[PDB]
Amino acid sequence: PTQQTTQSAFLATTVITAQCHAILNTQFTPPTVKPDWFDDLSKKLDSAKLVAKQWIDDLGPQVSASIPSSVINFDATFQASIDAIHELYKADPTASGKDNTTVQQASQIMTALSSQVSGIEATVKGMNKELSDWGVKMQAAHDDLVNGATNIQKTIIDLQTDIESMNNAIDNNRAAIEKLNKDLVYAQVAVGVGIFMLVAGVALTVATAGTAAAVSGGIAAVGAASIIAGGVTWGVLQNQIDDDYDSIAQEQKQKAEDQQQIIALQGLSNASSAVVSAIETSTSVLSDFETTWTVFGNELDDVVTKLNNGASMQSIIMEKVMSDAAKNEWDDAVELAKQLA
Amino acid sequence: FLATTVITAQCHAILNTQFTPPTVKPDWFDDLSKKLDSAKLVAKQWIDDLGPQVSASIPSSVINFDATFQASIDAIHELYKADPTASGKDNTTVQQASQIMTALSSQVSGIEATVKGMNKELSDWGVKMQAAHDDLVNGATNIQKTIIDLQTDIESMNNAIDNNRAAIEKLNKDLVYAQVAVGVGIFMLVAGVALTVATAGTAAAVSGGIAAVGAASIIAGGVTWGVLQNQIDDDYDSIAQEQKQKAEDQQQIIALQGLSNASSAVVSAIETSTSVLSDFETTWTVFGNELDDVVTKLNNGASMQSIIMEKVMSDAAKNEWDDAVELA
Amino acid sequence: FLATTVITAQCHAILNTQFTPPTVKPDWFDDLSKKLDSAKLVAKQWIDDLGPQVSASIPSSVINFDATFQASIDAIHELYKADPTASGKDNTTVQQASQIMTALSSQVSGIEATVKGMNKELSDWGVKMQAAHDDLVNGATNIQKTIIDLQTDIESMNNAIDNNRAAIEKLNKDLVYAQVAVGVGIFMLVAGVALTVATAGTAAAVSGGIAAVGAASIIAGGVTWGVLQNQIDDDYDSIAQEQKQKAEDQQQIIALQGLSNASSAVVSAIETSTSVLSDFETTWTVFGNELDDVVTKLNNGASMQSIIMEKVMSDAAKNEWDDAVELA
Amino acid sequence: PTQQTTQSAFLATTVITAQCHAILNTQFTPPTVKPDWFDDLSKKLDSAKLVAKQWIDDLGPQVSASIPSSVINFDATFQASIDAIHELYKADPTASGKDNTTVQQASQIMTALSSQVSGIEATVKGMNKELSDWGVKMQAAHDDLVNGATNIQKTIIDLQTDIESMNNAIDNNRAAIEKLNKDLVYAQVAVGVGIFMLVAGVALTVATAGTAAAVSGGIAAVGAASIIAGGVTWGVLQNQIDDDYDSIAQEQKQKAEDQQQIIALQGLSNASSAVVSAIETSTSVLSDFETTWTVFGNELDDVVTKLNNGASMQSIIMEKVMSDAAKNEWDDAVELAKQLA
């Protein structure tokens, strides 16, 4: 029927009303350290945001004035034309050739019906034009993401090699912390034998009254040197372990920020590409929906002119249009349009 | 599938939750509260201003279409039935129908204006909800920053506890050497004294040297025993303190994971609220153009304007009727 | 050899292989889990949506050609068997033929548009399949990365075990020297102290040097006996620790070989799926062009369109009658 | 015959789509250090994916619109319109000179078959034109890979010499670790002798106290020197062996990465050369398939102008164009083109 181009023209526009929100909700965080690409990819988001602004409060609501509202507006008069002709059937169902006044009255009322459906297709024309030039603005705010300062071709590869760089740094710092543990055990052994050799040296110096003070002073001096070496090595290695874990924290939150950036950029790119790919089908099927009502207006024009020429009132029942067999289909079409709202 | 109850449920969830701090509150937390309560400004400004307006715009369009519109259609219907052969705009009866037609199409213009103003009243509230979503999801990255920072802190405390346990093992194995030092020192001290007494002091230098390394070994092993035992107590206290810090910051991880789950739930709620506002604006501009239709039903013809406009009036009234009672 | 059964079997093979982490859970196994669950999302998006799409496109092409096409061919076969001579555009019989043919060739338009849109609905899925393939391979090279790393870890622990065994043999040789140092030392100590007590009345420090070198020999031999014995026990504990590391690394390498075989089976299934996908697009373009043939059939003549177009519709529809029962 | 060239041109293009899938399978992994040839042969891969991606989405399936669907659309009429003239033979089986409307209609049905066959070979021209531009773009992507910074003539050779470098460095490092094992044995006997003569020298110094104390302090001094020298030699050699096995890890991972890159570049070269050595046969035999329908177009059009001007109705059966054994071959053609599906 004609209902399945109405539902298809409404569905491909509700897809855009949904996915403009997917573009507009995409808003990534300012990082700790700000990269090079961050500013000149932000404005190309805002241009891709503001035109989606023109789909959330201006054109998104207005595309519902086109597809359900013009069909129910046409059927509001198409529920009135049939009874107005069916009442005048009882007066003169034989009057032909533009003779009786009521036949010419019904003729100019169906001419007003043709002007009403011409206004229907004019409303759909205005809505399709306001869809199309916004589509040029949204596509112009889209294709800059794929031509210059691209999110995919440059920054996805850049943030992937940045995530790999931070993973490499994390691996190097963890192997470094392993080696510093293996050196810290040596520092503790050195300060232990330093304690022992220092007290043994000064004890052999005192306990022999300095008769062997050369070798005992040597033992005490190597003990004090081992104390100092183990102590400052322990302090230095613990400072390097703490600074290595601070570096692990820094590049770990850097890798987290880069993952949060790539998911937002992939969402923005996929939403904008699907918005363009569905705006194409939306404009095409709205063009078919506009020409459907335009050729139906021309068909009603041909019926009006052939009714002005010579057509009998029973020849209108010989026609398909003003009977019950088409208004019964379009009652289901407006029931579908009430399902679509 | 009623898209007003969906926004009712989402704003109920947004007005519902109020997230609690962790044990130590960071620098952004109250600011995250300052990115929540502004949303707690709008979700009541929906349900105490625009929630009342969506429950007060429909009794203006069901009651004034129950009494005024039905009789005002019946009047022009009976004016059709009184003379179905009339013509002309300067007719008496066509004038009597045209005054009521222009009056009804002029008094639906005010309710048209308030419905078209309701579009603007929902528009700015929708963009404000979008902005309050984007500021809250802007603040909700510091939670992941502090979570991954405290995860690094947990890894650092695990490394330090492993280091201190290896130090406990090595200091036990060296404390054995300090005890062996005082043992062999006490033995060779009494060996030097007994060898000096037994040889009547003739083995003076040898047993004096044995006793000298004996005393040096007992006081050196004693000081090394005291220092290594004190160090073992110190890094047992360090193991206890770093295990306590690991449990405490792990508790902070669960607290901030609950906070991040709450903030993710609230921003997903506004994420769905934007699509449900899109569908409600779809239905609302359908109703606004339905009343635009009733205003463009001011069109008056020349001959018998009654059946050419008033059945369209009643049919658009019925299309408003079924949808507004679905919104009731 | 049925191409759709091949791809549904391969997608269910992607669904039933999840892979297990090794003992030390690395820093990339969460990323490999992300690559697998994205490939699972692609395989389940094909199984849950495009799967029933292929199985629901065919009864829509059978049922509409069961009765709706056959009533059309029966009607415009009656119009040719009863009146094969009528011509001219305003003729009533060719008007009936053009009415039922602009009914059929424009009621097939939605079904043709669906079957034509499924070409792009397959193409974006093939793009997502080759997308989920390559990041999975870039994650699965890290398998043999750590496999090579644990292989040289095995080599390092084997070299260190051989080093500790050579050190154990040399220390078990040097213990004999420390023990003969204690023996010769206690012999020279008792000889030197006997030599000093036998020379008490005069002086003999020549006798007092033998006992000094004997006492230093027992002290030095005892200290290195203790140190070399504790180093032997330390080297046995090091052989035990390195053999434990070698056993656990050999245990981890076969888990990594299993994970490598899992990622290899998944990428092999994706490759045969992406080839049989092109073999399915091979016939999907055939059915797309076959429903484009009805667009070629919509061009109607003026003079007895039955003998011009209707058996063409019957022959192409019978080719679709072959194909749609070949797809089930 | 008239079907086996269609099957041969289809066997020519399934080879193209299979080796194009072999091109799309080729994606080599990023190494730890990205060499000189990478950053170009990334995009010289990647662009040689994108034009190859044109075969994957549409154009490969669109050359599968040329052969196996046009035979169906051709015997939509050729299995049809032979039996239309068989009922026209019932009225006038010999009437010539354009006297009847039946002969004038059997003429225009053959002109309709002429326009249908011309539309078939025009669809074949469109699909072979798309194959022509895809084939020259595939040659355009093959040229810069196989000539400018050649993957096989340069980087296969440079990677083989890099593998030889890593092999010689691995054997060098394992010889160094064997030498370091022997030097470790010497350092262990150094510290083992040094502890003995240290404590022997200190016990001799504390016992003797003469010039024997001077030579005993010498013994203890060379003992402490041997302890410190053997100890730092032991520690330095364990440090060197651990760093050297980390070097063995680095070189073995580099050798495995290089073997993976060589296998990927061998697969790329085999796939792209098998594409380019078959795409010219694909265009040549699809041009053969187009000129087969062009020969069929003139071989129908001469029958058409003879049937218009001076043919009988038995003479249509007499010619082999409208014959039935050849039409049995042209039902075998449809069964073959459906077997190719």
Numbering used by the authors:
A (entry chain B), D (entry chain D): 10 to 350
B (entry chain A), C (entry chain C): 19 to 346
Please quote the authors directly.
Using Caenorhabditis elegans and Danio rerio (zebrafish) as host models for bacterial predatory interactions and infection in aqueous environments, respectively, we obtained evidence for a new V. cholerae cytotoxin denoted MakA (motility-associated killing factor A). The crystal structure of MakA revealed that it belongs to the ClyA α-PFT family, named after the potent, one-component, PFT ClyA which is expressed from a monocistronic operon in Escherichia coli. Our recent studies of the proteins encoded by the mak genes in V. cholerae demonstrated that MakA can form a tripartite cytolytic complex with MakB and MakE, whereas neither of the three proteins displays cytolytic activity on their own. Within acidified organelle lumens or when incubated with cells in acidic media, MakA forms oligomers and remodels membranes into high-curvature tubes leading to loss of membrane integrity.
One repeating element of the right-handed spiral consists of 37 tetramers that complete five turns around the helical axis, spanning a length of 216.5 Å and a diameter of 322 Å. This arrangement results in an axial rise of 5.85 Å per subunit and a helical twist of 48.65°. Application of these initially calculated values with local searches in a 3D refinement further optimized symmetry parameters and resulted in a cryo-EM map at an overall resolution of 3.7 Å. From the top view along the filament axis, the helix features a propeller-like structure with a weak, annular density embedded in-between the blades formed by MakA. Interestingly, despite certain similarities, all four copies of MakA adopt different conformations within the tetramer, as indicated by MakA-1 to MakA-4.
